């Protein structure tokens, strides 16, 4: 219900900014981006196009009214009196700050995330990137699971290419991802069937060419290192 937050008849004070949490619903950011009403749609840690496909655990909306000049102060890692006390943005908050002209309707002010002259309403969106089941997801269509074949997989906003096989791992219920020494995710739990699937990288091997001297002959023999003949 982004509309409620954006079209809210009553807006909160700049210093007394209010935080509404959006969860458990598909969110389409395209509509907001399309609407020209918003003078500024700068996104600090994400790109608007990607927003549609990325899935975030929680979305937080902060509503406050500030003068046109004050809009700049909100920006992360910027020193402005509004920013100094009224509202503070931590660096790399991975959220989009959206401001629209509200002077016509409008016409009290005085640690991160702690609470010319025309006043413009400003709503700040913060995206939670923690690893958890993601309540908020962009508009997307699921496809049938494929196993035992190399496949490109996008699971809950996680993209990787690997073979998928059934996993004998005793995944604990609270657990959603299994990771190896590297950040890459070894095992993933299906967002629709709650099954544990092992991920195996697609076969990769060096190709070596066995060549008798070019002068003697041009015939060549090809060796695939550590690759079964069946695979290739």
């Amino acid at each position: 219900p982004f509309g409620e937050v954006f079209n809210a008849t009553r807006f909160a004070s700049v210093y007394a900014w209010n935080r509404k949490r959006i969860s458990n619903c598909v969110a389409d950011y395209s509509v907001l981006y399309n609407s020209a009403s918003f003078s500024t749609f700068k996104c600090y840690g994400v790109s608007p196009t990607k927003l549609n496909d990325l899935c975030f655990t929680n979305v937080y909306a902060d509503s406050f009214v500030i003068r046109g000049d004050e809009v700049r102060q909100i920006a992360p890692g910027q020193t402005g009196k509004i920013a100094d006390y009224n509202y503070k943005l931590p660096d790399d908050f991975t959220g989009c700050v959206i401001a629209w002209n509200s002077n016509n309707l409008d016409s009290l002010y005085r640690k991160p995330f702690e609470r010319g002259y025309q006043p413009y309403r400003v709503v700040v969106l913060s995206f939670e990137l923690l690893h958890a089941p993601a309540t908020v997801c962009g508009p997307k269509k699921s496809t049938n699971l494929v196993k035992n074949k190399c496949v490109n997989f996008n699971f809950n906003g996680l993209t990787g290419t690997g073979v998928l096989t059934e996993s004998n791992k005793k995944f604990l219920p609270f657990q959603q991802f299994g990771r190896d020494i590297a950040d890459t995710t070894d095992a993933v739990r299906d967002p629709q069937t709650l099954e544990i699937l092992d991920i195996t990288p697609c076969s990769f091997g060096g190709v070596s060419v066995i060549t008798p001297g070019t002068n003697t002959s041009n015939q060549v023999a090809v060796l695939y290192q550590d690759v079964n003949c069946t695979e290739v």
């Binding site: 590297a182 890459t184 990288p201 990769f204 091997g205 060096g206 290192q225 550590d226």
Partner: peptide, 21 residues
């Protein structure tokens, strides 16, 4: 003697001379 001693792009290449040789 043999009893006592114990992905990405990394790979191990087999030695040319096998232990039997």
């Amino acid at each position: 003697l043999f009893n006592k001693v114990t992905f990405n792009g990394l790979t191990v290449l087999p030695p040319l001379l096998t232990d039997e040789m």
